């Protein structure tokens, strides 16, 4: 039974783009359809966010905040100074200015979207003491985001999120394989990587870094520059936050708010081998993961640095163990779902036999009823007591 009227907001991972980008092929639904549209049509009011795919969680959290309330992205004077990029990004009209007046949202996030969402809550609740002190000391203005004592997220749901990172980052030639993954996603959207499109197609939103695909430049050639740029080589990146190491550092300061419900969905798409119990990709796993990513994830161990057999089950991109909520460096509490959702803790909603891209429809999986999945989820979120 419906207990709240908060709209849902969709948030992508280290790939992702707006409803007008990719010629309208949806990150949220890919080849199966349009998930925002299903939810709207069933009376669950839903919006989509689009933030820097490769950018740091912090950056994406600041971009999400401006996209929601309205205004110019403000990364924080201290952060901008420390990392070497613009303080101010683009300007948004604001999807939900009512959040300034007591409105709230449910955030549904995929992949690294799940770190960004947790970071947005943490920033709203506590702000950033570093940003507050720096503003005072240098006599510059301060984004309300960094003050603290704000609240507008009623729930965060995460789907296949690397809360404790993914070992994929430790692969040899991770750099080249990761950009090949970006190319494989362009291909699923029927977009070539060797064509210098004059339309934008896929905006990496790297205003703060001063980076933009050039006239006459293809995605192949762009990515070769990106690989060599600060959005790939600095610690202020999705790359850094995605590693077991960065993820743990994030968990050190991004904690669960007592005022927000947390829901986690875990994914797996592998089988256990008969030799040493390595994991291998199942049939139907998206081809790029099955060939390039899954063998690595299902066999890479580091008994010193925590990584043992529990890490081998994966969804083709993320270790399944990483997904039920943050554990390394975290004091958040994770409880199995028991039929009542509780505020302030991770309600682990179970593991689904779906891969990283299938769960958002970017790869087909006809045995997966993705429409029922996301409708069932909208209905549980609509039942949450405010
Ligand atoms: Ca498939
Ligand atoms: Cl450039
Ligand atoms: Na992604
Ligand atoms: Zn930054």
Numbering used by the authors: 3 to 388
Paper quotes:
The interaction of the enzyme with the lipid aggregates induces the displacement of the lid, which makes the active site accessible to individual substrate molecules and increases the catalytic activity. Here, we report on the effect of an ion pair network on the stability of T1 lipase by introducing an additional ion pair at the inter-loop and the intra-loop.
The X-ray structure of D311E lipase (2.1 Å) showed a typical α/β hydrolase canonical fold consisting of 11 β-strands and 13 α-helices. The Ser113, Asp317 and His358 were assigned as the catalytic triad. Compared to BTL2 lipase, this crystal lipase was solved in closed conformation at high resolution (2.1 Å) using in-house X-ray diffractometer. In D311E lipase, the ion pair network was composed of five amino acid residues (Arg 274, Thr 278, Gly 279, Arg 303 and Glu 311) connected by seven ion pairs. In D311E lipase, the distances from these ion pairs were between 2.5 Å and 5.2 Å. T1 lipase (circle), K344R lipase (triangle) and D311E lipase (square) showed different Tm, which were 68.52 °C, 68.54 °C and 70.59 °C, respectively. The t1/2 of D311E lipase at 60 °C and 70 °C was 110 min and up to 12 h, respectively. The improved stability of D311E lipase was due to additional inter-loop interactions, which were indicated by the atomic details of D311E lipase with the observed additional ion pair and hydrogen bond interactions.
